[PDB]
Design a protein around this ligand. Structure first.
Ligand code: ANP
Ligand code: ANP
Ligand code: MG
Ligand code: MG
Lengths: 621, 621
């Protein structure tokens, strides 16, 4: 079963780039018939025009993908490489005839496709960057386009513009450097006066206006490349290939490019590697009636092959060709509507959208603010029960950066018992993705659920923590404050370690330092109390404090004790008494972790192996 | 990839029969090595003792499954039959030696297995049936067993028994006919005085006490069958096969059975069909030194083959055999912990558990009470965002039965746009499973989201309703009150029909009748206003009322009109004006549904085909 998801820019109802191709295809399926189907699903003229492209979520180098290069062969060639959920496929225009605005004015759906496309690259690269008035123009053009039938006096009104700026929220297409820079009534009046003049245009006309104003700030007709040109004295330039010029290239970054020939004169194409270990590609260009090749060498065979496709497809387009002028050295598909959407992988997007959220209420309180419960919406397995934490004060950037540091650290984990953060927010009050622990804190449940606990339950609590902090040691961070207050319950047979505010990555080199905060002493380990030395030693220690308190029914540690007397009685090697009904080897391992030799307190991985054995003995006997 | 889920009675921490085998096996895997692994996972003696069984969720006839009958061959033999999520596999004891209590007292984990097992069948069949004192005894024995280490003065206390009766809730193992029959302080004192005498026992002893008291109310040692015996004058009796007798059988339902021989005298076994078209099975029984067979014929070859396994396995058990005395006419497995739990199907359980729920708050108000938002927890894709509706008054059984009738009707649907109810509750305030529509009612969103709507959006609203009510007509119910108030929004590109309080199944024969309620006239269709005739006619009518109001931006129907004047102006054939910005063929189909000929108002299936075409034209142009 071969299924492919192909993003595109054919307008859909809900959010603007969730335009997702469910394509079922065969083993021999070419890109030709796939996209043929995709466009026949939208009654379009332009046929040899859309460039199919590759995309790796966690990278930036891509492949403008050939057609007869087999679909399954791509799937081979780049799942031999990396897992698919980071891979991704993208379809785009790459080609434009002479008056492309006109020969796509005849084809309105492709005009919208190119619109969405060009604007895509815009909002990627230059959205929060190019100036105020530029983006205001482009944004109110975006208004009048997306609104095919809105009035002209629509946004003249007080409350009804409050509608847009609040309920919609203009993060969709108005960018940051404006929107988080202006007063309320100010920005009201500002975009009023902007929108006053664009009251009337339709899809076609609004869109051609967009191009009219968008041409200078970026040459969307082309895509600028850098390379080096020459036969055997060679020089490293910028490069430009587009319909406005055919093929020309520069003498200054600011030069009017020096034309020499168009795509129309092309005979054939070839790409090949730079002839050394550099990750680079040659590019030679034989042309009609030319004894001469326009030789180029640029940072990649990747883009070399892609540029070969560039010339090949303008040849196809603005001649009568539809064939491969690239000199190299049965099958049916069907666009799936919904069915079961089998089968997407996991997500990794950091930026968060604010529409698909349930607003929650009090679940927990953190150092930076209240905690919340909500659900996120996506493709398969949607409306996921999820949670968020927010900061009460946004006047200090410092706590903002720590609040960020949470997620920016907590990204990279991977285990069945480390909690599922996904995303990042970037405005006040910045909030968080939380895999909600439905059960909540284990101090309160243990306190009020005395008759709802079992010997196996406490052991498996410790077992989950075992594998958890084992994985920490496999990937080197010192949590510094492990506690049931910071321990969450997912379900009756499943706990999870949280609270990574104090967690640090050791360069494996010895200790961590100290900053500020009244961390509880009774829980803390002696060497660290004395010298700010948090390592595997105190890890095993407070791990044992945790195992203890779990098995205590979680009564407060060192009951009726003073933090100064604590370390003195530790210097008297005093450890806390066994519980009632405590089994032997479990307590034995607790004592092993109670070794006043911090170096010889045993590790969690070994304790987990021991906990695994103690758990079986308990369930057995 | 072959994976199997096998329920069992080996105690786990959380709810008592969610004890789920994740078994990965091979193409040749016998039941022998599978269960060998399952028990080696629990360090058990008893080896040739557990009977593997089949189970069909929506039926009651099963198969006590043979061992060397291939696992994949079962999967064949009964997925050629029906879909798997209704199929199910079950493992049990079927065999007991002479002093089975003793030869399982040597094997405590199997003692618990048999405990859970026998109690399973108990709570299936006779839980809410056998008398007060019987179940009180059994229930406080259940207490002292599940509590391996609780005190004896534990439930002597006021608040701490309030703990059990509230937070636990005794639906787990105390049954209905008591629990919903007694006053608060009464039942407190009652089960106090019950529990006073069982203060001390352990697993082993509590469990043997359970058997001591449980033997008379049911002969768990055996399972009673009915059949007919004789060579060529034949007679239809009840039958009993167990270890307490070996093999004996009755002359009265109340007779002391007349023993003739044990399992020990058995030579060989055979089962075969009743020799006619009856769905029945023969059962012949050749015995040691016997010229005679103990011939039986009973309602099924199913149970004939199973009883062949009965005798075969007591032979195995209480002789030195481990071989198949049934006369018929490489492979490795590994118990999976969690991994990804691939791959379970859909659920259909009606009875609801009250532990895995989030308590919600006001989402909507129904005729019977407030509506709520919560999440359910299960195996794969758990913590699902779900919803419930409750009734304010529980003093009227009538509204209870209608509130039940909701679900008991709404069970059988199947479509991507009919809403996902699952379960049934059976005590005040009875609540409901709801696939939450996160967006909510479409009247309010349309009213306050005037600038957030698109032409495609309204068309696809109508399209979803198209396929929905098309499926109604394919399965024959008249909703009677279709409306956006009753229309829900799942997501921006997805609406769902709800409100099945008025919905009725036509025997296809003409009309439905009328009861009571101030249903809105403006929405209703003329013939039904006049004669209580709700059929495809009024279906198409109010379907058009719905399409209209959707396209209206949902302003109230017949603005400033009196319900009496309504039908008069209908008799003047008056229909409501086109909207602003209304497209042609969409309005045309609205008018087609506006035909004062109710017989010739076109159906939804044809409208859906037309809506599908109008939607494409809009997205195209
Ligand atoms: N994923 C979650 N699921 C459920 N509740 C959560 C979750 N995350 C945080 N909470 C709640 O918020 C409380 C504080 O979380 P925590 O991560 O310990 O915040 P903190 O700012 O580091 N507080 P502190 O323990 O003093 O360092 C927890 O005790 C929970 O009640
Ligand atoms: N599945 C659901 N998801 C979200 N909200 C719901 C859901 N079911 C019901 N509601 C809410 O409860 C309200 C009443 O639901 P409904 O099924 O129409 O009840 P009713 O008793 O039949 N009321 P009525 O329309 O007068 O016949 C709806 O308008 C919603 O606000
Ligand atoms: Mg913290
Ligand atoms: Mg109703």
């Amino acid at each position: 079963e071969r299924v492919l998801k192909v993003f595109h820019y054919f307008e859909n109802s809900s959010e603007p780039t969730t335009w997702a191709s469910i394509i079922r295809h065969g083993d021999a399926t070419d890109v030709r018939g796939i996209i043929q189907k995709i466009v026949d699903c939208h009654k379009v003229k332009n046929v040899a025009c859309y460039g199919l492209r590759l995309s790796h979520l966690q990278s930036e180098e891509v492949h403008w993908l050939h057609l007869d290069m087999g679909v399954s062969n791509v799937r081979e060639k780049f799942e031999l490489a990396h897992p698919p959920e980071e891979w991704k496929y993208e379809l785009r225009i790459r080609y434009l005839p002479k008056g492309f605005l006109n020969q796509f004015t005849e084809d309105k759906p492709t005009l919208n496709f190119f619109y969405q496309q060009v604007k895509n690259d815009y909002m990627l690269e230059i959205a929060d960057q190019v100036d105020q008035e530029i983006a205001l123009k482009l944004g109110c053009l975006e208004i009048r386009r997306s609104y095919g039938e809105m009035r002209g006096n629509a946004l003249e009104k007080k409350s009804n513009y409050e509608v847009l700026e609040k309920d919609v929220g203009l993060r969709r297409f108005f960018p940051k450097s404006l929107l988080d820079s202006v007063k309320a009534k100010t920005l009201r009046k500002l975009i009023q006066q902007t929108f006053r003049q664009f009251a009337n245009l339709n899809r076609e006309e609004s869109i051609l206006k967009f191009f009219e104003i968008l041409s200078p700030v970026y040459r969307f007709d082309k895509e600028c490349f850098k390379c080096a040109l020459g036969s055997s004295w060679i020089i490293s330039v910028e490069l430009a290939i587009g319909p406005e010029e055919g093929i020309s290239y520069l003498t200054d970054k600011g030069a009017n490019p020096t034309h020499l020939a168009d795509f129309n004169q092309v005979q054939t194409i070839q790409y090949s590697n730079s002839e050394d270990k550099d990750r680079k590609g040659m590019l030679q260009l034989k042309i009609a009636g030319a004894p001469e090749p326009l030789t180029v060498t640029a940072p990649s065979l990747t883009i070399a092959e892609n540029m070969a496709d560039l010339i090949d497809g303008y040849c196809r387009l603005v001649n009568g060709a539809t064939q491969s002028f690239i000199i190299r050295p049965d099958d049916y598909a069907e666009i799936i509507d919904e069915e079961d959407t089998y089968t997407m992988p996991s997500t990794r997007d950091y930026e968060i959208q604010r529409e698909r959220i349930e607003l929650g209420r009090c679940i927990g309180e953190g150092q930076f603010g209240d905690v919340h419960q909500g659900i996120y919406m996506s493709p398969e397995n949607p409306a996921m029960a999820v949670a968020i934490k927010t900061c009460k004060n946004c006047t200090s950037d410092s706590v903002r950066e720590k609040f960020l540091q949470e997620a920016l650290t907590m990204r990279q984990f991977d285990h069945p018992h480390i909690v599922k953060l996904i995303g990042v927010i970037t405005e006040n009050p910045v909030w968080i993705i939380m895999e909600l622990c439905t059960l909540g804190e284990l101090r309160s449940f243990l306190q009020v659920r005395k008759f709802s606990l079992d010997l196996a339950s406490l052991i498996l609590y410790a077992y989950q923590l075992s594998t958890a902090l084992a994985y920490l040691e496999s990937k080197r961070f010192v949590h510094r404050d492990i506690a049931a207050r910071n321990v969450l319950v997912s379900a009756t047979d499943c706990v999870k370690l949280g609270d990574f505010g104090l967690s640090r990555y050791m360069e494996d080199s010895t200790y961590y330092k100290a900053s500020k905060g009244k961390l509880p002493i009774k829980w803390m380990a002696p060497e660290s109390i004395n010298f700010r030395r948090f390592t595997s030693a105190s890890d095993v220690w407070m791990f044992g404090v945790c195992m203890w308190e779990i098995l205590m029914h979680g009564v407060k540690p060192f009951q009726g004790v003073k933090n100064n007397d604590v370390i003195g009685r530790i210097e008297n090697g005093e450890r806390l008494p066994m519980p009632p009904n405590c089994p032997p080897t479990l307590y034995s391992l607790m004592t092993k972790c109670w070794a006043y030799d911090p170096s010889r307190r045993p590790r969690f991985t070994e304790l987990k192996a021991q906990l695994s054995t103690i758990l079986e003995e308990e369930k057995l006997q």
